[PDB]
Design an enzyme around this catalytic site. Structure first.
Site, PDB file in Angstrom:
ATOM      1  N   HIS A 117      -0.855  -8.066 -18.999  1.00 55.58           N
ATOM      2  CA  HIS A 117      -0.811  -9.478 -18.622  1.00 55.58           C
ATOM      3  C   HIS A 117      -0.430  -9.617 -17.151  1.00 55.58           C
ATOM      4  O   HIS A 117      -1.069 -10.428 -16.453  1.00 55.58           O
ATOM      5  CB  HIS A 117       0.173 -10.288 -19.495  1.00 55.58           C
ATOM      6  CG  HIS A 117       0.440 -11.606 -18.857  1.00 55.58           C
ATOM      7  ND1 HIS A 117      -0.450 -12.645 -18.909  1.00 55.58           N
ATOM      8  CD2 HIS A 117       1.510 -12.035 -18.147  1.00 55.58           C
ATOM      9  CE1 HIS A 117       0.054 -13.664 -18.239  1.00 55.58           C
ATOM     10  NE2 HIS A 117       1.252 -13.319 -17.747  1.00 55.58           N
ATOM     11  N   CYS A 127      -6.491 -13.225 -19.763  1.00 56.59           N
ATOM     12  CA  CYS A 127      -6.325 -11.829 -20.105  1.00 56.59           C
ATOM     13  C   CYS A 127      -6.346 -11.613 -21.606  1.00 56.59           C
ATOM     14  O   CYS A 127      -6.152 -12.539 -22.408  1.00 56.59           O
ATOM     15  CB  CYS A 127      -5.058 -11.270 -19.479  1.00 56.59           C
ATOM     16  SG  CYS A 127      -3.563 -11.239 -20.455  1.00 56.59           S
ATOM     17  N   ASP A 160       0.031   6.088  -0.069  1.00 53.68           N
ATOM     18  CA  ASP A 160       1.016   6.015   0.999  1.00 53.68           C
ATOM     19  C   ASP A 160       1.315   7.417   1.525  1.00 53.68           C
ATOM     20  O   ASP A 160       0.908   8.429   0.923  1.00 53.68           O
ATOM     21  CB  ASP A 160       2.256   5.290   0.507  1.00 53.68           C
ATOM     22  CG  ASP A 160       3.103   4.761   1.650  1.00 53.68           C
ATOM     23  OD1 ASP A 160       4.155   4.143   1.348  1.00 53.68           O
ATOM     24  OD2 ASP A 160       2.746   4.908   2.862  1.00 53.68           O
ATOM     25  N   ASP A 191       0.387  -4.613  -2.157  1.00 55.15           N
ATOM     26  CA  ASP A 191       0.804  -3.779  -3.265  1.00 55.15           C
ATOM     27  C   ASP A 191       2.215  -4.183  -3.627  1.00 55.15           C
ATOM     28  O   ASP A 191       3.017  -4.545  -2.772  1.00 55.15           O
ATOM     29  CB  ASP A 191       0.770  -2.297  -2.914  1.00 55.15           C
ATOM     30  CG  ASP A 191       1.993  -1.926  -2.099  1.00 55.15           C
ATOM     31  OD1 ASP A 191       1.946  -1.928  -0.853  1.00 55.15           O
ATOM     32  OD2 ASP A 191       3.070  -1.620  -2.685  1.00 55.15           O
ATOM     33  N   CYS A 206      -4.056 -18.244 -18.699  1.00 57.19           N
ATOM     34  CA  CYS A 206      -4.459 -16.868 -18.450  1.00 57.19           C
ATOM     35  C   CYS A 206      -5.586 -16.431 -19.350  1.00 57.19           C
ATOM     36  O   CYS A 206      -5.521 -16.658 -20.564  1.00 57.19           O
ATOM     37  CB  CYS A 206      -3.236 -15.968 -18.625  1.00 57.19           C
ATOM     38  SG  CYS A 206      -3.542 -14.222 -18.262  1.00 57.19           S
ATOM     39  N   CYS A 241      -3.264 -12.566 -23.693  1.00 56.95           N
ATOM     40  CA  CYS A 241      -3.034 -13.970 -23.984  1.00 56.95           C
ATOM     41  C   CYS A 241      -4.096 -14.485 -24.947  1.00 56.95           C
ATOM     42  O   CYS A 241      -3.884 -15.519 -25.586  1.00 56.95           O
ATOM     43  CB  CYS A 241      -2.986 -14.735 -22.674  1.00 56.95           C
ATOM     44  SG  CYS A 241      -1.563 -14.418 -21.593  1.00 56.95           S
TER      45      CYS A 241
HETATM   46  C1  LIG Z   1       4.481   4.175  -5.361  1.00 57.31           C
HETATM   47  C2  LIG Z   1       4.974   3.710  -4.029  1.00 57.31           C
HETATM   48  C3  LIG Z   1       4.100   3.460  -2.956  1.00 57.31           C
HETATM   49  C4  LIG Z   1       4.619   3.003  -1.713  1.00 57.31           C
HETATM   50  C5  LIG Z   1       6.055   2.844  -1.671  1.00 57.31           C
HETATM   51  C6  LIG Z   1       6.778   2.366  -0.403  1.00 57.31           C
HETATM   52  C7  LIG Z   1       5.754   1.581   0.388  1.00 57.31           C
HETATM   53  C8  LIG Z   1       6.373   0.853   1.537  1.00 57.31           C
HETATM   54  C9  LIG Z   1       7.123  -0.338   1.333  1.00 57.31           C
HETATM   55  N1  LIG Z   1       7.491  -1.023   0.237  1.00 57.31           N
HETATM   56  C10 LIG Z   1       8.164  -2.047   0.576  1.00 57.31           C
HETATM   57  N2  LIG Z   1       8.341  -2.127   1.858  1.00 57.31           N
HETATM   58  C11 LIG Z   1       7.684  -1.064   2.401  1.00 57.31           C
HETATM   59  C12 LIG Z   1       7.563  -0.629   3.743  1.00 57.31           C
HETATM   60  C13 LIG Z   1       6.826   0.583   3.973  1.00 57.31           C
HETATM   61  C14 LIG Z   1       6.614   1.188   5.374  1.00 57.31           C
HETATM   62  O1  LIG Z   1       7.101   0.530   6.291  1.00 57.31           O
HETATM   63  N3  LIG Z   1       5.942   2.341   5.517  1.00 57.31           N
HETATM   64  C15 LIG Z   1       5.409   2.917   4.402  1.00 57.31           C
HETATM   65  N4  LIG Z   1       4.720   4.041   4.604  1.00 57.31           N
HETATM   66  N5  LIG Z   1       5.542   2.493   3.190  1.00 57.31           N
HETATM   67  C16 LIG Z   1       6.223   1.294   2.905  1.00 57.31           C
HETATM   68  C17 LIG Z   1       6.935   3.098  -2.754  1.00 57.31           C
HETATM   69  C18 LIG Z   1       6.385   3.544  -3.973  1.00 57.31           C
HETATM   70 ZN   LIG Z   2      -2.331 -13.107 -19.884  1.00 58.53          ZN
END
Ligand SMILES: Cc1ccc(CCc2c3nc[nH]c3cc3c(=O)[nH]c(N)nc23)cc1
Ligand SMILES: [Zn+2]
Ligand SMILES: Cc1ccc(CCc2c3nc[nH]c3cc3c(=O)[nH]c(N)nc23)cc1
Ligand SMILES: [Zn+2]
Lengths: 357, 357
Positions: free
Chosen positions: B324, B295, B92, B255, B293, B298
């Site tokens: 898990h 994994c 990110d 993610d 599962c 488990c």
């Molecule tokens: C480790 C880590 C990676 C990424 C993030 C934030 C990741 C994250 C979002 N998470 C939930 N909603 C989100 C919206 C956005 C967004 O609009 N822009 C960006 N750049 N990141 C978001 C937080 C922690």
């Molecule tokens: Zn499992």
């Protein structure tokens, strides 16, 4: 395999190397036993503990009888299936980790009889007699009282184990020598224990604050008092150099929470001595923790990365440091074994020390 | 392999399954990306993350630029060699995790240009444009301002990436759609991003507190605005059921820190819904976390044991719960992929929900 058979394959001086055969597997001696304090070797899966070369682990009665409960583990199949370790487990008796003391036992309840029963419920392969570990320093009178009590408790332990036939037929029982730093008390204790008869003999009451010089001095006269043909277990020892010198004095088995505990604290063992990976000097060091170590951690990750993880409080940092430290100890024990087998252990002990220090 | 090639092998409704080929490996879509917040997927070795079926992980710019430092990781060889993960990494931009805001960027310094440079220094395979994630709820005026700023920053991101030839030739760049919950702003954003041109398109500004109903409603109109032939990444989502419904709406990549975070907190995902392993009802339950599962957790350990570990604060508890949960999510993504490939995803989505709830 047999219930219990200790065979000595080679000797050098007082040092010995061989095997303990038990139903759940073979234990190479001299042996290092990783410690599991709440039915886990901290931060390692049991398959990882085995991969480092451990043949046996030490299980936690004190923690286990409190949590999760001995009866509970028995209901669930015993400690081996509970934690996923199918090789031998040695359990301590709770004669250290715990109050109100009396001739019957300790409440906080634990007696020789209940301790032996708990180890049975856990499914321990090597059961330790229930003892009293004498504070250090101790006056001769108090050391004698404590030793004598321990010897009466050792007979009660012996008889509790023998009356329970499944335990007596499948597990082994070790007695524990007391007497603090006093030769005559160590001798009385040894004689009492040999008269009762055990499968192995621990040297108790050390690693309680005395220095290495003092511990070695007490071992010099104490270990020859024990039956030669049974294993000698030095409880709670120790640092790599403590281990080498104790083997030089006739000890076959070791346990220590140092590699785990101190690993999580940033201390890594190396052949050039311990390092603290938190130190800023490692932040950009691309070398492995130790330059010769064969462990998976040193094959794959740098000091700089493990430094970063431990500084960040990351769980993987604890995992990697602990895997390395326990692998390090197993490699030490293997070098010890091979060198005794080849008649070059005293040279190994010197080379080891000149470099470690 | 190519720098970047997304191929759609099968479709059902708005759902799609295929592959993203990149130099460091192939990513099966729909994909779930385990999150590594300080150059580690918490409590897992990278080989374990791979064994659960992950093809790509999400790396932490915010944490990484602070610790250990972007320049430092570059000096050490980049994030892949640092952490021991040799497959693709999506980073990110720091457009969420971070102050003082201005058109230039945010100090706390981070600008579109510096964010793209940091991701280069880390050696990211999928670089995210530097954006502003609009708080929820947001008024239309503020959502518009934030979206417009993000779109200007998206052009600056594009141009920073393209001027750095090693990055442009070896990594991919994704743009991020903003506009909060407003259809017209989502459309302006989509159009701006398509005009600039990216390798993939994230739906940003969701998973910021809105409910599942609202998130799905915004996806219903937002995802069709994005180029059909590029991947669609829903940032920060989500729960298993959020994932199934988002795939039903055209999302290809996910993610979430839920499986890791909540795992360490005692929550385990199962096909019958989440359980909290700390609950006393599991203290003597010999079943695995989930009855189907595949994994390793488990296969090997019981609910009762993992209950014991988490109650005791044992590191192995965090390890097993996290392995898990991440395996569970990868099995979900595989069931999603196979069901779209076989034209039975809408049936899968119904069966899934009837049982999970
Ligand atoms: C480790 C880590 C990676 C990424 C993030 C934030 C990741 C994250 C979002 N998470 C939930 N909603 C989100 C919206 C956005 C967004 O609009 N822009 C960006 N750049 N990141 C978001 C937080 C922690
Ligand atoms: Zn499992
Ligand atoms: C997990 C765990 C296992 C065993 C122990 C205490 C183990 C331990 C000793 N450790 C250092 N010195 C020690 C002496 C004795 C002793 O004299 N008797 C017993 N029964 N245990 C000892 C503590 C924790
Ligand atoms: Zn190592």
């Amino acid at each position: 395999r047999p219930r219990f058979s200790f065979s000595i394959a080679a000797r050098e001086g007082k040092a010995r190397t061989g095997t303990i055969e038990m139903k759940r597997g073979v234990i190479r001696t001299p042996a290092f036993m990783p410690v599991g304090t709440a039915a886990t070797v901290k931060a390692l899966k049991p398959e990882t503990v085995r991969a480092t070369g451990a043949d046996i682990i030490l299980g936690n009665t004190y923690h286990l009888m409190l949590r999760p409960g001995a009866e509970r583990i028995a209901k669930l199949g015993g400690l081996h299936s509970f934690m996923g370790w199918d090789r031998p487990i040695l359990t301590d008796s709770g004669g250290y980790q715990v109050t109100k003391q009396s001739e019957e036992g300790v409440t906080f309840m634990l007696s020789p009889e209940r301790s032996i029963e708990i180890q049975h419920l856990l499914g321990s392969d090597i059961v330790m007699a229930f003892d009293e570990c004498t504070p250090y320093p101790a006056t001769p009178s108090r050391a004698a009282s404590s030793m004598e009590r321990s010897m009466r408790w050792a007979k009660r332990s012996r008889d509790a184990f023998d009356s329970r036939k499944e335990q007596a037929e499948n597990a082994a029982l070790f007695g524990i020598q007391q007497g603090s730093v006093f030769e005559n008390l160590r001798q009385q204790s040894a004689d009492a224990l040999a008269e009762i008869g055990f499968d192995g003999y621990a040297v108790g009451g050390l690693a309680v604050g005395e220095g290495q010089d003092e511990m070695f001095r007490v071992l010099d006269f104490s270990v020859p008092m024990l039956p030669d043909d049974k294993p000698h277990y030095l409880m709670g020892v120790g640092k790599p150099d403590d281990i080498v010198g104790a083997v030089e004095r006739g000890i076959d088995m070791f346990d220590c929470v140092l590699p785990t505990r101190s690993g999580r604290n940033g201390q890594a063992f190396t052949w050039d001595g311990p390092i603290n990976i938190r130190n800023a000097r490692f932040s950009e060091d691309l070398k492995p923790l130790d330059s010769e170590c064969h462990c998976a951690v040193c094959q794959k990750w740098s000091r700089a990365y493990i430094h970063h993880l431990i500084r960040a409080g990351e769980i993987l940092g604890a995992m990697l440091m602990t895997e390395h430290n326990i692998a390090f100890y197993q490699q030490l024990m293997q070098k010890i074994r091979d060198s005794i087998s080849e008649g070059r252990f005293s040279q190994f002990a010197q080379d080891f020390r000149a470099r470690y220090f």
